[PDB]
Every structure is written in structure tokens, then in C-alpha cells.
């Protein structure tokens, strides 16, 4: 109906009441916020811990428990985030090991775009981004390319924004998910530098710079 | 001639006076100690910041500099030493991306064998560990595999002691350097688990435990 709930199951939000295009993936166990506004036979959502907003198909409303406990989001400082940023790391390896392709809107897993693989692997322990790669960009604290460590972000994209996000690793490798036409299909390792294979100099050539982690996101008033 | 050195190039420690095979191999910039001990064309040594003996060839003594400075080991609190993880684990992942295989006493890189893969990504921060297996068993705090988080060891061998070791990422993943006999004759990615690869049970038959690195390394009095 209307209010606060939780997901039973990962469930897909359109970007449109018609949900012909996947805009994100709420995991099980996260909250959402349902609105009166239905339209088609959907209904307009926003997701509790990056505030993202969506269309829910109506068909997903017994997927959805209420909620009696609110969410209220967690404060990291720096060193707290530092000291988990092992776990995000191993959290995009785990995944590069699965049978996975580049989905757009992929959130949940196995499947991940760029800043899907960003999102999860962060909130794998706790910390949340915003879902978009320009929001990501936005958030963290800009940083130059020569002060990259293991954990940072790497954007990628036109002078205009970001649209291609990474985790850095260490000595220009990183680790992401590319695309099929551009990149390979899936979570990978590229490296920054011009002595890459055409994978990593195709985005090599778009890297826009570097932004580190220094807080959780802390959803808008309401 | 004697006493506290370092080394102006990756030097190669043997396990006997004939350098016949590897013991560990000393980064360039390590220190090391010359014993009085000469025989054949070796000398004695031992590398002060992990104590590991060997023998080192008198046709390396021109890559030896006598040290104004001495060794001196760092000291790490756990908190520091979980900020680094990230780290640790960023250097297995690149070393993973340049061709290798197994070495017995591979320390240096590309060519590693289990346990110098350990050292050589521990000490890419500073952080000391013993040179072989069963030493690191030793030196690192034991915890129950329920307890694995990323960046604790994880350690394999007969009921008597640990001859393998593998750096845990997260979900029963571990990069590790295998033998090419049972293993991928270099760095890769296994799991804790029956549903694994053929790779990976052999490895989880032969599962001892897992340890945490608390402190780093403090050589003997001396």
C-alpha cells in the first residue's frame, strides 16, 4: 500500500511505469518506500539507502513486507571505511569469479554494470554509494590520479561526466565491469596506461580522474 | 667481508653452500647479515628482517653495501595493520596479471611459491611476515574458519604441519601461488568448498586452518 517496506526478494525497479528498461536491483532485506503514485500497473518507489527512485511492478507487492523497524543509516569515519576496503576488494574478485555479463541496471548480482559493481561491493559492507556513476563521482572526495590506492574509485568518461566507474587496485590496475561493445561483457581487470591491451586503452583514453571513499551516504531529509 | 649489509639488487639465498637450490630470494634495499661461515663459494647469511638463513653466493658480494643504518622493525597495532589489507590483497591481484609460475623460494616476483607470495604482499606495506608456511601458521593468531575474513591466511597440510598457504578474499575465495603438480603452477583463485573446481578440492582436502596477522614481524635478539 504505502510507507516504508522491506524486500522478501531482489526485485527489479523500472525507470519508466511501463518497466521496459531496468534503472536498478533492490536486494532482499533492503527498505523502500512505496508512494501513492501508481500508474500502468506499477507503482513509484524510492529505495531507502541511496534514495533512488523507480518504478515497482505491482506484481512485486507481495515480495514486500512492511517494515517495523526504519531504516536509519550508519556512520563511518575515514579509518572505519579504510579498514574495510579489503572485504570491497574481495567482494568484486568473488564476483569476477561467477559466470557473469555487463547488465544494465544490474545491482544485485551476478549480473553488474559499472556502477552497480561499485554500489554492491561498497555496501557488501555496509557503505553506501549513490547508484550512478556521475552521482559516484559526485560523492566521493576527488582526488588525483597519482593519488590512487587500493579502494578508490576511477572515472571514466566524456569532459561532460562520468558514465564508467572502476575500483582501483594498485600500479593502474583496477577492477570493473564493462561493457560488450567497448569493453568485456563482464567484471574484469584493466590496467591505466597506454602498455594495456585494447581493453584497457579504449578506457584508458576516457579517464577522467579519481575519487576516494570518506563517508556512507545519508539518505535526504523527509 | 661481515656483519649487517644491504642489497643493491634482488639477490638469491640457496639452501646449502653448492647454490644448488633456492631458499628465498632478498629485494633489493633488504638487509642482511654476513656470517663468518664460508665455505665453498657461498657465505652464511641471514636476512634481518625475517631471520631466514641461507647461503649467498661471494660473486653476489658486489650487490652487498655495508649498512650506516640498521634494520629496525616497525611495530603495527592490529588497526593499522587492517588498514593495509586492502593493500595485501591489490598486490596479489596484480601480481596474478603478469605471466608466473611456481617457484620454491620465489619471493621476489613475478615467480612465487605459496608462502613468499604471503611475504612479498605483506611486506609491499611493511608489514613482516616469516618466510615459510609453517611459520606464518606459527606467527599469525589462529581463528576458526568461520571467523575468515579478507586478508587473514588460510593454511593447508598434512595433520603434522602447514606446507600451503593462500590469502583469504571473502566466501571461501583465496588467491594463492599452487605447484603445477596439484595445483595452477602459479597465482589463482580457489574456493573453500566441495563445489569448487578439482584445483580447489584438493586444496580444501587438505585444509588445516586459518590464521590472523596481528602484529608484524619482530627479528631475534642479537
Known amino acids: 500500500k504505502l510507507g516504508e517496506y522491506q524486500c522478501l526478494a531482489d526485485l527489479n525497479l523500472f525507470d519508466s511505469p511501463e518497466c521496459t528498461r ?6 532482499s532485506g533492503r527498505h523502500l518506500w512505496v508512494t501513492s503514485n501508481h500508474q500502468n500497473l506499477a507503482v513509484e518507489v524510492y529505495l531507502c539507502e541511496d534514495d533512488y527512485p ?10 514486500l513486507q512492511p517494515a517495523t523497524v526504519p531504516y536509519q543509516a550508519a556512520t563511518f569515519s575515514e579509518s572505519e ?41 561498497f555496501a557488501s559492507v555496509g557503505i553506501w554509494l549513490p547508484r550512478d556513476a556521475y552521482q559516484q563521482e559526485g560523492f566521493t572526495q576527488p582526488i588525483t590520479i597519482a593519488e590512487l590506492v587500493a579502494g578508490d574509485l576511477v572515472f571514466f568518461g ?19 565491469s564493462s561493457g560488450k561493445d567497448q569493453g568485456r561483457d563482464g567484471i574484469g581487470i584493466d ?3 597506454e602498455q594495456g ?9 576516457q579517464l577522467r580522474g579519481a575519487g576516494r571513499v570518506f563517508k556512507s551516504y545519508e539518505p535526504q531529509r523527509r
Chains 1, 2 share one sequence.
Do not use: R
Not at 531496468?22 to 536486494?27: G, H, I, K, R, W
Not at 579489503?86 to 559466470?99: C, G, R, Y
Open 81 to 121: 571505511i579504510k579498514k574495510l576496503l579489503a572485504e570491497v576488494i574481495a567482494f568484486t574478485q568473488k564476483a569476477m569469479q561467477q559466470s557473469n555479463y555487463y547488465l544494465w541496471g544490474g545491482t544485485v548480482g551476478p549480473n553488474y554494470d559499472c556502477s552497480g559493481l561499485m554500489q554492491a561491493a
Open 191 to 193: 590496467i591505466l596506461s
Open 158 to 176: 566524456t569532459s561532460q561526466k562520468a558514465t564508467h566507474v572502476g575500483l582501483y587496485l594498485a600500479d593502474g590496475y583496477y577492477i570493473h
Open 54 to 63: 523507480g518504478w515497482l511492478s505491482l506484481s512485486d507487492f507481495d515480495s
Open 22 to 27: 531496468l534503472a536498478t536491483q533492490s536486494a
Open 197 to 205: 591491451d585494447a581493453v584497457s586503452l579504449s578506457y584508458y583514453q
